[PDB]
Design a protein around this nucleic acid. Sequence first.
RNA 1: CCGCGGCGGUGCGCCGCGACCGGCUCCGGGACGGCUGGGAAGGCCCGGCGGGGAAGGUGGCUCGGCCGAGUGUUACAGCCC
RNA 2: CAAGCGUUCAUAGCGACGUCGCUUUUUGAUCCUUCGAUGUCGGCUCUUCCUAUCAUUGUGAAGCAGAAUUCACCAAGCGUUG
RNA 3: CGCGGAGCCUCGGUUGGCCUCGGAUAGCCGGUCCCCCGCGGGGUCCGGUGCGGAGUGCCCUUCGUCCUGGGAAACGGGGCGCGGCCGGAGAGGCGGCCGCCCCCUCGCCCGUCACGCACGCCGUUCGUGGGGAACCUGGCGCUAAACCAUUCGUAGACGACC
Lengths: 138, 201, 190, 175, 109
Amino acid sequence: VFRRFVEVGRVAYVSFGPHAGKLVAIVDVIDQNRALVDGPCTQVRRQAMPFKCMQLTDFILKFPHSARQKYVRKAWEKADINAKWAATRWAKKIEAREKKAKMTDFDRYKVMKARKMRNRLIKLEVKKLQKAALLKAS
Amino acid sequence: EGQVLVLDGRGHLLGRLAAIVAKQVLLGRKVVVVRCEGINISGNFYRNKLKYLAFLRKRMNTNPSRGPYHFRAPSRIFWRTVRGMLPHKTKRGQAALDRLKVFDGIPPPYDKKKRMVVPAALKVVRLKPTRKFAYLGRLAHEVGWKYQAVTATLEEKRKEKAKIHYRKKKQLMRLRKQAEKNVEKKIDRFTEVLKTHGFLV
Amino acid sequence: MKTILSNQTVDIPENVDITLKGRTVIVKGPRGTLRRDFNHINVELSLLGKKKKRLRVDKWWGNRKELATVRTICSHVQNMIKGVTLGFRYKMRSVYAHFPINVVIQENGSLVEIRNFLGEKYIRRVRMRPGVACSVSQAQKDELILEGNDIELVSNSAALIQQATTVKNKDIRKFLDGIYVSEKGTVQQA
Amino acid sequence: KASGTLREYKVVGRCLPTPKCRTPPLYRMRIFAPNHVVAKSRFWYFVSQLKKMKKSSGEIVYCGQVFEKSPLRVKNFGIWLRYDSRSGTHNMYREYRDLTTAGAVTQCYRDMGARHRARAHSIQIMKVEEIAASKCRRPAVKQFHDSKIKFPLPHRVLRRQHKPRFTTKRPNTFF
Amino acid sequence: SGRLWSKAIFAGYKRGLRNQREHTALLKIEGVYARDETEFYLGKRCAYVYKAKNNTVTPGGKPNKTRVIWGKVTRAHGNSGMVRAKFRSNLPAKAIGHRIRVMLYPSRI
RNA sequence: CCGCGGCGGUGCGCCGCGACCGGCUCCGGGACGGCUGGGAAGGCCCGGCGGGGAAGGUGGCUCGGCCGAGUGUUACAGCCC
RNA sequence: CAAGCGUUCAUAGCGACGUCGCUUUUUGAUCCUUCGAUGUCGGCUCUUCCUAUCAUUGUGAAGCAGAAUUCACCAAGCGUUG
RNA sequence: CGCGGAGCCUCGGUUGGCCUCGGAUAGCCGGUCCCCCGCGGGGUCCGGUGCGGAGUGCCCUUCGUCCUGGGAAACGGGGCGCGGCCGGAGAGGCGGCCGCCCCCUCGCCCGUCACGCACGCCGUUCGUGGGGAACCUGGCGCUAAACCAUUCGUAGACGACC
Ligand SMILES: [Mg+2]
Ligand SMILES: [Mg+2]
Ligand SMILES: [Mg+2]
Ligand SMILES: [Mg+2]
Ligand SMILES: [Mg+2]
């Protein structure tokens, strides 16, 4: 059973291609592999764009089925995608990948350290929880 | 990557896998394909049986003990298909095959190692869902294995065992997560520096 | 040409309670419980009707030959419902010129034992499948009654004895003897 | 002719003037090709069938793109077609639902390849024309065609099957 | 105290099918599967390194058992992030499907 | 002899660097011409003139908590085209 | 393909006038190999393969009641004699 | 078995990752208040994740040495430290879990000083007590069979075999 019903107005994140990593309102469906697509506030012209290069989100919005930019400018703008996206779990694990690639050798030295002691302060508690789990078993 | 490879044959495509194995065998990487019964083939069951039985009739008339060896175990069957994709007349090709190693079921050492999966040979990916097939296990049987029953009962015995480990490992993670929450203000300015350059979010 | 959508709703009665584990439909009514897997056919089985009123099978990016199957799943489900409410009854009437086909059920259903078809000494035996209760009728002379919940199982079993009883090296235009199915129906009719 | 992605290299050309006839007629064909140099060549194949006209005895006056008046707006392209099968030579109505006349036949040329093993050098376009909603015959097209139109992308394979050429995780295809 | 010498395999020497040309070797660097990817590996020194039997001198050291053919990556080799490298002496074929050790120290960052 | 000053030849053996130049293979930028004096789009609005899907609609039916959801039809615009 | 025969009825079984093929166990063409010569006909013995199935196993046909018989399928498993 | 000293040679390497099952028009995990079974397993309910963050795009562990004199962290680690009980057999070869001795006080911030600063240069670093082939110390065990010859034939050319 699916939950994402490629409508007139599924917001879709463009997995890849010339406009990778941008949200896009599917204005209207052309064919069995191509949509008429537009990302007003994410900077993507009304153009054709295939279902293979796009993945789609729980979000919908409500322009009708060949509305003309100004009207998908709104419906995006209120409803407010670019803030609601960024409270999602997408946006925060994207913008994490981002931040690892975007990481100087310094940063990485810090983490090496910060991890180590985290992973000890976490470990000593796990050891102590098994002590309490063994004394509970007694 | 480096070190020894372990590939879990289930859900793969007999030759599609073997081409990928054989490339990396020739680049010096040690591969160990496991669980070859599970390995599966495009075309319907019989098709490939009929195609195997065609193999079995191919046989050196004037003496057969020289003639082609139609090994019956899936390990061996696959080996063959890998081998046909090596230049095995030559020294690097035989030196290659030695870097390969192939089992029916999943043995000592290799039960006890995490283990990988070639999506580009993986059946769910490479095939269409409305198409027919053989398991090299059942193929191997109807051609003259003796050991489909045994490698079943042993793998059921291994699965039951592995499940215990999976469940105990499951129980340690539940301790990790509860112990993060039971100590989250003397690691609350380390976890900070993790999530800032991406790690752990 | 791929057809964007095809679908069908089965109207489920108030007696029965189907509950689908993903794709696998299980059905329990008065009579018993049945199960069947559509882990091949590849469709979307929703149970949309609340209280519990509709099975709906979708099909979705399907070309002609899978669109067929929408309706076939839809059938093996009705066919289950009729089985677990009413239950089926295939009757099969033995037929002859001369040697009386001499039937005798022999555990409960299970063994259907046939002396004398066409004077043959070999006593044909036939197993039923699980859940298929054969029984020799009354209110009629040469006539079996195969009762069961599952159509599939009840009609192999008809056919097993209908086919076990075949003549060889003759005119089967002339030699019209054996046991064969006369009436596919139900236990309870309503 | 071959292909790439076609373009409307529209063209007009007179049969150059003799002493007897000084102002001979001009004729726009919607020649419909991958660049100029062929779309030039392709009116004259085409005109030489119709008129008594030829590369010696003529001139192209104007050749130039006609380039889409409505390319952000989806449209129902029909095409009174003609081809040459291995047997005979055959006329067709066909519908493509692209948003741009050229791209619409770009389709057609790729299907005549596939649905008939007809190569471009055998095909002839009589005329493309965009059609309204109604007056579409082909159920393939006649479905994309509604308002509350609805998909999932059911058994979505992974591509990037070589980024991780191997992995521990087996893929996923429900999304 | 670690890599530096970054990990790579020597795959074949540049070849057609009924020929092979032993100047240029084909170098399969680890973690580089695209021709976009590989513009770092250009210009870098590399080394097929061995030991063999008789001792030999070692700069900043005593005479060791180790030797090296000592080379350089010229350019990329087809879509998949293979690289072509020509060493000073030609490579000895023994090395096919072994290590070579592509460095950083003619970096260009 | 100490200069290793200035000139002419080299390198014992392994090497590394630099800057010109030739040929190449690449990679960043930035400025313009034309064109159906480009098509397309945007924004701002405005004042008009028409047609289709189809409603913040209405209505037959369904499903859910008047409202929300589904289908069906006339089509004006309080959507859009 | 099909005009007929087959009491009737094309096609159970057949099937004209035509026409499309294989096959290399028939003979021809040909002259590519061999004339510093590859033992030239039959018989015996002995292997193995093919099917272009005569038997037998399992089948579908008949203008098959039985009996007996031809048409065909998988089929080359074991048979083919004095 | 342990732990000792030289030296032919043959090479490949230059952190590890210690684990479910499988589905794919679906899965993952939590928690059960409740129910059944043998700390577990199955069930039902709800709550989370699901272009997956108890993510192989993954996790871990560190990588110039020690001084000493603060904070954060505090019983961690060791002595081929030493005995006993496990569990693991598919071709185990590995874990695991318990006493006692002695020794050490290490992850992260910081002060504070130090280590041949070899005077821009290469095979640097380890898996290394590698694999194998030759020889110098102690304790405990060890203590042949095979072939020939002969005989026999159960076998025969000789060979082979009983
Ligand atoms: Mg008879
Ligand atoms: Mg070394
Ligand atoms: Mg007649
Ligand atoms: Mg001779
Ligand atoms: Mg035959």
